[PDB]
Structure formats: structure tokens, C-alpha cells
Symmetry: D2
Subunit: 474 residues, 4 copies
């Protein structure tokens, strides 16, 4: 347990006050992180804007080199970092190390994607004959200062997924990790520091959201806000952003539509893996099964068999189901479970809770009057909602305020594509669980699920603008 | 003078209350536009969302046919529409007709640009070997209901520049013109009505900002806000946008940097043309001259002689300088002229005001102490600021809160490019006035100049999103 | 009614001292004559084209597009007039011939709008080495120069315009050499461009005997690009005569229809027959061999047989499904394939009949790969059904062909169909539908002997443009 | 010291019954020997490549990229080992030879990362016709098959890797035929791919005598694509042997450097001399004629003269600017161009000397269009200065050449330079800098006799790929 420091203008800085961070699964004290003041935030942003001029005028090759070096150090330190990440957010140990490796893969991919950035030459003669000698040389430029806010459930992966695309394009960056997860974000920062990233190009901010939460987002120095977290926090960010560009990755309630001709064994396998991965603490998780009545009984029984095999225990033992992030999270999940039971749902697996470790709960015969049909639990509970027509399944799917992803299980792929067109989501996975991977694919959501398009090349594009130079050929 | 009506769900609807419109130059009564209630706004949006489903399922070529017919109708009625448009916002008669013709060019170009919408196919094997059989089919979709808000100084051109890109992409649209400029916006709507646009696919809103101003923007049926107007109004819109995507075309203070090796006569021609067009009531217009001392005196003389040749009079006579949009506008410009005179600027041309018809005022020896060096006048007044180094011109240029376009006048193009890379603007014009065109080129502004990227293909991309369908090849 | 037709040369209409009489293949009716150009007259066409190139490539895209749109308008106006003669010249159904002219106008309009929004690119030296971070490349599109467009008899207007309009929008000049059978239809298409006001020499035509100018028009150093549709052997020859100059070749095919056990057999049969016997099978893109899993072969053969029996057999003016073949050699060849299959023991499910060069549609079942009909492109109304017992065997037999234009897969398992498509050596695979070139914005290409280059509108434009790079250092 | 080298054949190293001994062109030193393959041994190379193609193209992009990155890493490691031998083999400066190997590694790495993230497209039938609005085309990239790569003596590693890496990342298999003079350097490159673990048959080498296998390796049916850099006459012969198969040719140049009256003459002279005399002028891309406005010609000539007189002349081991030319025939040819210019009255501003095949750098002024040096590519250290009176004249003379690779424009008026560039019949125009292929992400192409196809990394990958369309109807 160390006293961790922020990276500020090439230096490691403590603050007057600090926040002690405990392992959710064991209460073990892991260390402290600084409680930055609003003025300390100003200093970070000031250092970053000063470094921006020299950073954006480097070559793409040179900026890519730092990112590649940082990714190499992350791979080297994957076990060290993953061990601490595992404790900090109660994530299975092996899964935590895999998160660090995936972050390195994304950083390397972003570097090589961004370095081949291309512009366009537009012909005035495409629009009016009199301007045929006028051409526009359109080149990309960084937006400036990117504020990256990562989430507790991917405190390294969804930090690097923001940082690396921003840096390659010439942006400078300030990372605000979640307090629960700030140790992991600082451990990611060290790899960038050791890679030699110039002073102020990349910095970190830590503190409680009461002191600095709104402040870091409102600050006029910030040119882009890239956030992953809860919908209510993300909606608040949208207001404070003003005219500034944003990327928001918010909640989800992904539907898994199972038609009558589906491969029920494949459906059940994917639904359980996607729904209960990391105890259901993921935006891109199967969170409601919309199953045609004719196959519902059998599908529910095969899902139940797989849920009962999920291990329930501690992160260090690589348990499928680990304790939730904090007591409020599990209290909210328990309330949803109770509301379903009170309204008549069938508990195919039994609710149990020891501390914040909730056993995986599978409900059948869930109806739309139950909170569990709509509210995102961020816990290990899955509702099965029976439907009688595919039109009903589409309407119930679309009635959700969320629209991140959806799955369609069916052997009729032309019909599945037609269904996909009508779903109000970013991505539809056919005969597979929802997921944001592979990380080159676009990742986005409709409605309250957020704004902007992620995925590596899409993040790069989102965090750049264009500069047009127009002249007349003579 | 007639009673004008809003296009709502295929019918021309009146309101209980109405607003009488008068020509700003003559006081002639041109007619009345409806003063909608919030309930009538609700009905407009309900019609749009109800028409969205059928509209988005049409083929691209079917949507393009409506736009082509609307543009053909505008060309037919260009004289008729321009004649009234000239009265409504005191634009030169010939320039008003040219606006309508240009709008049709944009509408046709948008139709053909958008109908060739392509998707992309991404390989899971680009990122990891285990996903080589997984591919993503990424296709474009509309964002939903687009609220289009046009400006008084281009009430047709910068209405159609938003409507056509939206429509071709399968969005539905509600056009909120400015009250002064609503007749022209409704005349534009007639062209779309006569083209047979399905009921609810395109609608108009008119009314008072105090009743429906914020209501139309914050309404939850609106999925995209596309606005051109003043920077304080745009800032208000960004706050009300929340998470929803926006496009804002706000103010400008475009600088014209004139170096020592410049063609001073050519610079003066372009500077005067760009600065005093439509009496300076344009966001993209030379609004300040940053000239090196050595050539300042000769440049000022060449600019002065050209300002003296500008005609000053009534729109129907095609005067270069016409009466400003309203008395508040002229009052504000008079105050900037007075503040510069009182601080010691040399008026190379005489300030004369007759009603709201202000004569073109050219100031020399302007300094950063004066309001005219920074504030956007939206009137026929042009400051000349002398600088000693290129670094000083760049610093003064970027110190503005606006960053729309810039002009560089020089014979050294490699140097001009290096300067353009440092200017915080969307577009840099070499040896030419700042201008929005050609309409296929990107049009964007940095800082308080707005958000998002316009130009035809860029507009279409902004007002679409993507839908990814992922599946495994077997 | 048998007019004497003229070539469009540098804005003028020119006869030649000798001529070639064109006869209707279905009736023998004399339709007119076309000039038999000398090599010296070809020289004049090419000299006029290169002269016009300088002023044509320097027009704006908008100006070039306006000419194309006008020409397409005129084609739509005269679609009945032109289709009436096209039908006679190549013995194509009257309604089909008119539809060809309409489809050509749609391609021309689409090419103009596709080509005018062509874009360049800006590349960063700093993408590759830090020392060149201030060096940028401004890359803009340019035409290749003079494009020789050679159209085919089976689409003498459609696959003339598919070359002319993409070439013209990008700033190329064009010379159209139709086939003798199809030259009248090509000159009628030329009328529309002339009336559209296309500048003198920007678009020209050439007609003549192959023994006089056949190789000459290709070997001429004035030609910078050859865009050809026709037979494989004739296309192979052009490949040698082209030298280093770029080419596009649209040659023959032997498209396979793979029918799996889970396929909708009735739908598969409908698509197979429509694609196989359209225009009497005289189409490079067309189902020319059914590879059917044995479990469903009997039912599929029965479904196909009943449709083939319903095909009409008659004259172009009657819009018969099966019209007379292009000439006597073509019909003899088809009869030879029919006789080899019969002699080797194939089952004729429909009756062979021949009146002149009008061959009735022949469906064969139980075809084996020792039969010529299994491999050789007939360009006639005959279709073999070949039974297989595994998908792997169907893939091997499909890929053993020297042709690789398109393939159809009929199945309800689309993930599997995609895996099969990855292994098929073809340009395009159609799922639960017949092979086809359309829609004309899609890519159209063949592997192996089926051709060279990628067509479809935007792809055809890219093939007939090059790049001009301007590199400078920012200071 | 002199080693016996072997070809890489299906993952094994093979000798041949006969071999070819390679000697250092600067010293006559015996460097080693390479096999003299027979036609049957060529058959075995191509058969092994075609067998490996199926397994190679079904790998993921990342897997293929990993092999390329490993090979480059090995190349950087052995850059001094390989550079030292390359220096001797083609009489290139020792330092410049090592740099060529390093640049090859850089190009290989760039091609790996460029190729792995190439994408397909989804096209809408509803863009062309309403009735097809539910039909979509899923268009993905596929390799062309076996790529024959032919590298040149002047860049035997760099312009081998510029073909091998783009070909491989796209899923093609490759056979590399280096030039005899340069075959050792080509086989040393092959070792780096072998040590990287490239699967057997995916990459192979061929060496032999042109009189034995010269045409055979190109005419072979197994080859699906020929990618060649070398002389124009050799490249012309490849075009006809290629048939319908796609090709890329990098041939000769006669790049003009147009110097206008407002140009910085001192900077123009520096760039002209560095470009014209690099590697003794043995480069297709290189200033080979100066077209200078007569008002500044006198001052430019003296500025060029001063720098030419400073160039070092000597052995590769000493890193001289001017090294011995590749062989005697090449020096004889350059001497004949120098003599023709002298005999026709040109002014020699620097003296002509020839030690063996080491020719001193000759600058000629007052060169006229009747002199062979004004037109013919010397591939030697001689540079003509040609005085013009108008920019129009400079454009005309430039465009009269049968070569059209690149051109330089030296001036302060960039809008005018851009207008001049549009009129130049070349691939790339450099403003106020020497002509050059780099940076290697930029397009590299030539007009007229200067080649065919567009090079540069991403352009090379696109040229050696095709498309596979899968079309279906949404329900």
C-alpha cells in the first residue's frame, strides 16, 4: 500500500489531502490517491495547453513511437498492474491482467491507425464551373485538450481507449479516473511517463466528484470530454459541455431476441456469458431476454443450467461472480430483485447475498410492470421476458431508454438483418452475445446510451477537426 | 401582403395569433407569419416522428427525387421568392435572387451526394486472429428529427443547406426560420410542398422566442439541432442540447493578414468585397485587417478608394450597402464606430447614418484597446490594425474568441501554409477573401464560431449515425 | 428503311468508300450499312481525339456532367426508336431491347454524378519519417487520355455506355468501336451524344472489317486505354496487343448455381431458369451449370424442367424468351455441346429442336464432368445439372473452371454460404438469387479467364483515371 | 570470403547444377555465386507457391503482419552485414547501401500496418434503383494469387521489399527474381524472411540466366501478377508476355527541373545536383535535364558548376558521391552521349574523365534538342542544361519526352507552379525540391513509357488486391 501521485507536467505530485482506497471484496487497504483542488486542476490544464504547441507539431511517426513504447511497458507490467486492478475493482485476477493486455493492443492499434491520417483535396469544379481552378486542401488537426474520464469497470482499458486515439492525433490529455479505480489509472499513467511522453502532453487528475466533478468538465480549457460511466452522470456532463464535442458511453439494457428457429444451446451459452460476465457490471451485456413463447420454457431451462455452474466467490480465485463494486450497488440490485419477486416473477435461481456478493439470479416470466424489465442493474440478475411475435419483441426492445447493442438468435439471417434495421441500437450481433469488440469495430449507442462513435478509428476521427486551406491554381 | 401559414403535416396551418413583418428598409408591410403556441410545436413534432418510419424506409433514389423537384421549383420561382426575400431582410434584389438559385444548387448537390451513401465492412482479423471470421457490416442511418434554424441574413440558402442534407439521409425536418425572415423560409417550404414531400417529413415552425424559443430546442422529440445565428444564441442552444448532436454556425471576426510581399491592390479588392458584402451582415467576412507596417499606408489608400465606390441605398436598387436588419443592429454598429473614433482611430471614410442605413466606415490605426478590434459588428465598418511581425498578426488573430475563417495575402505560399497551420480557424483562404463556398468544401468554425462541420457531404455525415451488424462466417 | 449509317468523327458524320451491310439474324432482313473504315481513317479519328483531349480535360466536372445528362435525356426520348432497331440487329426481344436503352441512360446519368464529386487526397510525409513532417503530397485525379471502348453484340448500347460515360466524366476522350453486328445500334447511341453537343473529337466512333482494322485500332500508340467486352479468345488477343497500356476486359463465364439440401427448391429453380435462359443464354453473367446436392436433385430437376417447358420460343418482335442465336456458327457450336452431352449419356429433360438458328431450350440432368457441356460456355439455351454429394465437391468443380465471373448459392444457412463464397474463385456471389451484373453501382468483375479490371460505375471511373501528385514543403 | 548462395524454395535452400558468379563492379572482386535455375526448377518454385496460397490467404491479417514485422526486425539487425555486400555488388556507397536495407525494413513495417487495416464497403441497391432497395453488396478485398516480383540492380533490396511486403500482407504468395547483379543482395533479403518463419512456399526466390528462364518466369500460367522495376526495353517486353494478367512496371525517366526567373537559384542548384548525381545518376527518379529561363541560366549554371566540382569521385568503400557504373556497356553508353553533346557544340562546364567504368560528373550547358543527351536516359553522371525563353517552351520540351516520371519546378509563384504542374505529363511534380520517390507512403507512378500502375505502399497493396462481392436481399 503506497501513497500514489498524479502525473502533472512531467512530475509526480501529491496533494495536501488524499483518498484511501480499499479492495471491495476484502476491505484491504490498497493505498491513497490525491484529493486535488480546483486550483490544482487549473494547473494541470495550464500545463497541458502549454505543451500542446510542441506536441501537435511533432510528426505522426514520433507520436506513434511514444504510444508503442508505453504499450510495451504495459505488457511488461501486465501482471503487476493486473494484480492491483483485480483488488481495486473486485475483478477476477486473470480477467484484470487480460484487461491490461487488451489496453496495450488498443494503444498499439491506435498509434498505427492514427499515424496514417489522411486529408482530402476537393475540386471547386465539382460544384460550379467558375470555380474549377479553386481547390481545398483539407487536413486533420487535433481538437486540443481532451479530458478522458474512465469508468470503474474498465479503469485501464477504457482509459487507454480514450488516451491513445487522442494522443496520436496531436491532442494533449488529462485523465480523470474514477476514485475506485484511480490507483489503476495512475499505474497506467506510469507506463506513459516511463515511455518518455513529453511533460504536460499527458496528465492525470484525481479527487472526489464533489470538489472537482463538475469543475473539471466546465473548465473552458477543455476542448473535448470523453466519458464512460453512468447515464445520470453522463447526462449532467452533456449540459456542462455546451458547444464542445463530447463522447459519452452510458448505460445499456441490451436485448437478446431469441426466435423460434434459434439454436437454443448456442443462445443459452452466449446469453449467460454476456449477462453475467463481471457480475453483470458492464454496459454492453445481455440484460433482458426477449424470447418467443414457443421456445421459452426450454431456453430458460438451458440458461438456468449454465447459471448454476457459475462460480461465486472472490476476485483472487477468478470467480465468475465477484462482489459488486460497493454496498449501494448491491442494495440497488437487491431492490430490483425484490420488486420482480413481489410482482410474481419466477426465480429460477435463488437470491443470496453475503456482504456485497450476490449470487446470480435468473428470473422467468418477467413483465413490463417490473423495474427489472427496464432499469440497468449493474449486477448479476437477468430477466426473461416472453413475447408472442417478433413485432412485440422489437417494440419492447425499442421501448427502452437505452439502445447500446442487441443480439438476435435465429437461423434466418435475411430476416435477422431486417429485424436489425428496426432495432434502435448501435450494434446488432447475430447468433452471438453483445460486445464492443473487436476494438476496431464501431461502438456506439442510441438514446440515453450516450453520444459519439467509439472504436479506434472512430475515436481518432471524433477527437480531430479539419483545417481547410483554399487557393486558386493559376 | 398576405397571411402566411406554416407547413404542418402536409397542410398549411394558421395560428390564433400572428406576427406582422415589415421591410427593414421601407417599412412596407409584407404580410404576417403564425405565432405558434407550445402545443402547436408538439403537434409539428408528433407529425414528424410519425412520418419518420415510412420516410427512412424509402430508397435513396426515392428521397433524392423529392429534392430535385424542389430545386427545380425554386429555380422557376427564383425571381418571385428573391423579390420578397429582398424586401424582408433588405438584401439587394439581384443578390436575393442569386441566394435562391444557389439554394437550388445546394439542394440538387445534396440529393446526389447523399444517395451514394456507402457503408463499410470491417475485419475482426485486423485486430485479433481469433476473430478473423467475424465481420462488421456498418451502414448509415438517419438520426431522426432534425430541427433546422436558419438565419435572417441567409433565410433561404442556410435553410436549404440544412434541410436537403437532412432529408436525403432519411431524417425528418422542422424548420424554424427567424421571425424577420420567416416569410422567405415559408416561401422555401412551398417549394418542398409542391414537390410532394410526404406529410410530416418536412414542417415549419414560426413564433416568438419568448414563447417557443427554448421550447423547440429542449423538446425531447428533437434528435439533432442545426443552427445558424448569433454566438450568444448558439451558446444558449448548446446548453439546451444535452447529449444530442448539434451543428452551430455562429459569429466570426475573420482576419485578413497582409504581408509585405502581398499584391496590395488584389488584397484590397478581396478585403473590400468580403468585408462590406450585405453591409457586413455575414459571419464569414473580413472583419479586421492585420497588415505589416511597411505596406499599411499603401494598403489603406487602396482600400479607401474602393470603399468610396460602394453604392449606398435601397435594396431594390441593388445598392452594395443597404439598411441594416433593425434599429438595434444599427445602434450597436454606431456605438462601435463612436468608440473607435473616441479612442483615436482615423476614419478614412465618413460615418453617416440615415435611419438604419449606415455608410461604409473604414478605420485605420485601430488598436486592441478598441471594441472594433474584437466585437463582431454585423455592419459596414472595417478596422485596419497595423502589426510589426507575422508572429504578432498570428497572436492577435488567435486572441479573438472567434475562429471561423482567415485570409492570407502573400506571394510566399509555403510561408502562408505555415501560418495557416497556426491560425485557430476552420478555413484559410490564400490571396482571396474569406468565403463559405464552394458549398462542397468543408465549412466550420473554431472556438465561439460554432460546432460541427458543414459543407454538403459533411452535413450529411453529421446528420447520420451508423448501425453495425456483426456476425461470424462459418 | 435500310439507311446508310455514318461514323461520328470530330463532330462530323463520315461515310467511307466501302461499307458493310448489316442483316437481322432472326429474319435476314437488311437493316442498313455501316462504313468500312481504312486504317488511315482510324488515324484521323485518333488524331481528332487527342487534339480534343487538352480542352476537354480542362473543363470543370460540372460542365462535362452536363453533356452526359443531356445525352441520357435524348436516349430516353428515343428509347423506342433505338430499341426497335437494336432488337432486329442482335435478335433481342423488342421489350428487352428498349429496356437496354433505358438502362443505358440510367448508367450515364449515374456516372456523371458519380464522377463529378471525385476527390483527391492529402498525404503527410510525417506519416513515414519525422524528417519529412513538413512535406505533403497533394494528390488529384486526372484522365488517362484516349479510351478505346469496344462494345459487344449482346449489349451494343448498354455495354457501350458503360464505358463511354465513366470515361468522359473523368476527362478522357473516347473512340467507340462496336462489333459489326451491333454497329448500327452503336452509331444510334452516338447520335444522342452528338445531339447533346459533346465537343468535336471528344467522342468518336469507328466501324470496319476486322481483317482491315481489327488489330490496328488496338495497337495504335494514340490509344492510352482499352475497355473491351466480348469473347474470351478475342479478349486474350487484346491483352497481347495492349503492351503496357491499361486494359479492362469483360469476357465469358460459366457461373455455377450451388443448391444445398436446405434450399428453397422452387425459388432456386425460378432464379436458375431466368438467369440461364435470358436472351437465349447469350450472356457472360448467367447460370450455366447447376451443382446440386444429390438429396434434392430429383425435386430440383423436376422444378427446373417444368419452367423450361414453359419458355416461349420464337421471334424478337414477339418478345419470346428464346430467340434465334446471333449467327449460324454460334448455333452449330451449341448443337455440338448438346450432341456431346447426349452421346455421353446425359438425360435430356426437354426436347432439342432447331429451326434455322433458333434452338429450343434444352435441360440436361445427370451431366458428368467428362462432358463438354460441363465446362464450355455455350452462349445458347442449354443448361446442365450436375449432381454432387458434398459442398467440398461442388466447390472443387466450380473452381476447376477457367471461368470465374459469378456464382449463386441457394441455401437457408447464410453464415455457411459466406464461408462458401470465400472459397469460390469468382468476382460476385449472389445468395438465393440468380447471378447478375446489377445493380450497376455494385462492382462487376471476373477472376481467371472471365476478365481483367473492376467495373460497375464508380469502379469503372477509377480504372480510367490516374493520379497527379504535387509535393511541397511547408515553411 | 566468396560464398556460394542458394535459393529459398518451399522453405528449403536449394542449389542448382550450374551457378552464376557475381563480381564487384567497382573492383572486379569475386563476391560469390548464385544458382542458375533451369525451367523445371522454376516450375517447382511456382508449384510450391500455389500450394501455400490457400493456407496463407486464410490466415488473419494480424498473423501475416507479424511475419512481416519479424522479417524487418531481422533486416535492421543485419543491415550492416547485408549493406556491406550490397555496396560491393552494385557499386553503391557503403553508407548508402546500409541505408537501403534500413529503408526496406521501414517499408516492410509500414506495409504490414497499412495492409492489416484495409476495409471493405457496403453498397446499397437503393442508391441505383428503388426496386433493389433491400439488396446490398458486401464487398471485401482478396489477394490476386502468385506475385512475381522483379527487383532492379540499383535498388535490389529496397525495390524487392517494396513488392514483397505489400504483396504478402494482402494474402498473396510471392516469388522474387532479383537481377543477376544484385542476386546476392536479394537472397540475403530472403534469409530474413526465412528466419522470420515465413511459411514454406509463401515466399520464394528465383535466380538464373535471362537466356534460360528470362521469359519463362513471366509467361508461366501459375503467375497471376507481375511487378517489375527495370529498364524501359525490358519492361516493354513484359507487357506483351503478361497477356491479360495485371502488371506494375517501374521503368525509366528523364525528369525535367524547370527553373523560373523568380527561383532561388542557390537552392535550385543544390537540389538539382543532389538529385541528378545521386548514385552516379543511376536512378529512374532523378533530375536529368534542366529547363532554365534564359534570364537566370548563366547564374544557375555557375551555381550548379560549383557544386558538381565538389562531388567526390571514387570507390563504394569510401562513400564517394560518384561511384563506378554498373558495367562497361552502361559506361560506354554514357560516354557516347557525352561525345555527341560535345561534338554538337555544347559547353562542358566540368571535365569528362573515365577510369575503368568510373565516369566523372559532367555538366553541359547550352544543350539543344538535336543532342541525344537532351532526351535519352543516360543512367550515368551527366546533366544537360537547356535554355528556354518562355514557360510554355519549357512545358513543351518537357512533354515531348517519351518519359513522364516526375518533374521539379523551382519558383516563388506557387499558384503558377500548380498551373504548370497540371500541364506536365508526369506522375509527380515537386515544388522547390528534387524529384524523389519518397516518402514511401506517397504515390509513385510514371506516365507514358515511365511505367504502369501506381506505387507507394497503400497504392501497391491496392494494386495487388482484387474484390469479392457477396450480394443478398434483406428480409
Amino acid at each position: 500500500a503506497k501513497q500514489y501521485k498524479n502525473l502533472v507536467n512531467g512530475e509526480w505530485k501529491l496533494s495536501e489531502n488524499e483518498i484511501t482506497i480499499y479492495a471491495p471484496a476484502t476491505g484491504e487497504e490498497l493505498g491513497s490517491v490525491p484529493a486535488m483542488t480546483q486550483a490544482e486542476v487549473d494547473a494541470v490544464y495550464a500545463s497541458a495547453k502549454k505543451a500542446l504547441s510542441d506536441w501537435r507539431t511533432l510528426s505522426y511517426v514520433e507520436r506513434a513511437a511514444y504510444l508503442h513504447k508505453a504499450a510495451d511497458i504495459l505488457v511488461r507490467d501486465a501482471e503487476k498492474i493486473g494484480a492491483i486492478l483485480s483488488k481495486e475493482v473486485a475483478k477476477g485476477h486473470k480477467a484484470a491482467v487480460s484487461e491490461v493486455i487488451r489496453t496495450a493492443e488498443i494503444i498499439n492499434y491506435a498509434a498505427e491507425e492514427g499515424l496514417r491520417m489522411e486529408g482530402e483535396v476537393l475540386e471547386g469544379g465539382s460544384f460550379e464551373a467558375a470555380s474549377k481552378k479553386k481547390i481545398a486542401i483539407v487536413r486533420r488537426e487535433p481538437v486540443g485538450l481532451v479530458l478522458a474520464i474512465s469508468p470503474f469497470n474498465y479503469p485501464v482499458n477504457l482509459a487507454g481507449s480514450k488516451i491513445a486515439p487522442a494522443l496520436i492525433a496531436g491532442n494533449v490529455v488529462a485523465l480523470k479516473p474514477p476514485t475506485q479505480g484511480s490507483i489503476s489509472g495512475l499505474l497506467l499513467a506510469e507506463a506513459f511517463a516511463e515511455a518518455g511522453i513529453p511533460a504536460g502532453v499527458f496528465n492525470t487528475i484525481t479527487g472526489r466528484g464533489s470538489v472537482i466533478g463538475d469543475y473539471i468538465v466546465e473548465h473552458e480549457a477543455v476542448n473535448f470530454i470523453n466519458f464512460t460511466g453512468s447515464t445520470p452522470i453522463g447526462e449532467g456532463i452533456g449540459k456542462l459541455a455546451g458547444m464542445r464535442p463530447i463522447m459519452l458511453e452510458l448505460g445499456g439494457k441490451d436485448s437478446a431476441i431469441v426466435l423460434e428457429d434459434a439454436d437454443l444451446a448456442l443462445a443459452a451459452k452466449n446469453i449467460v456469458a454476456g449477462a453475467f460476465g463481471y457480475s453483470g457490471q458492464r454496459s454492453t451485456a445481455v440484460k433482458r431476454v426477449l424470447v418467443m413463447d414457443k421456445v421459452a420454457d426450454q431456453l430458460a431451462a438451458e440458461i438456468k443450467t449454465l447459471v448454476e455452474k457459475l462460480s461465486v466467490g472472490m476476485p483472487e480465485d477468478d470467480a465468475d461472480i465477484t462482489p459488486l463494486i460497493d454496498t449501494s450497488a448491491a442494495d440497488f440490485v437487491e431492490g430490483l430483485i425484490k420488486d420482480a419477486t413481489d410482482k410474481g416473477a419466477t426465480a429460477l435461481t435463488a437470491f443470496n447475498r453475503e456482504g456485497n456478493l450476490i449470487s446470480p439470479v435468473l428470473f422467468d416470466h418477467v413483465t413490463t410492470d417490473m423495474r427489472l424489465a427496464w432499469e440497468e442493474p449493474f449486477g448479476p440478475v437477468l430477466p426473461i421476458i416472453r413475447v408472442t411475435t417478433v413485432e412485440e419483441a422489437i417494440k419492447i426492445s425499442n421501448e427502452s431508454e437505452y439502445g447500446l447493442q442487441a443480439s438476435i438468435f435465429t437461423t434466418n439471417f435475411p430476416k435477422a438483418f431486417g429485424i436489425a434495421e428496426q432495432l434502435e441500437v448501435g450494434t446488432v450481433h447475430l447468433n452471438n452475445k453483445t460486445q464492443r469488440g473487436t476494438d476496431n469495430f464501431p461502438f456506439l449507442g442510441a438514446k440515453k446510451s450516450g453520444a459519439g462513435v467509439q472504436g479506434v478509428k472512430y475515436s481518432i476521427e471524433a477527437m480531430t477537426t479539419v483545417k481547410s486551406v483554399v487557393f486558386d491554381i493559376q
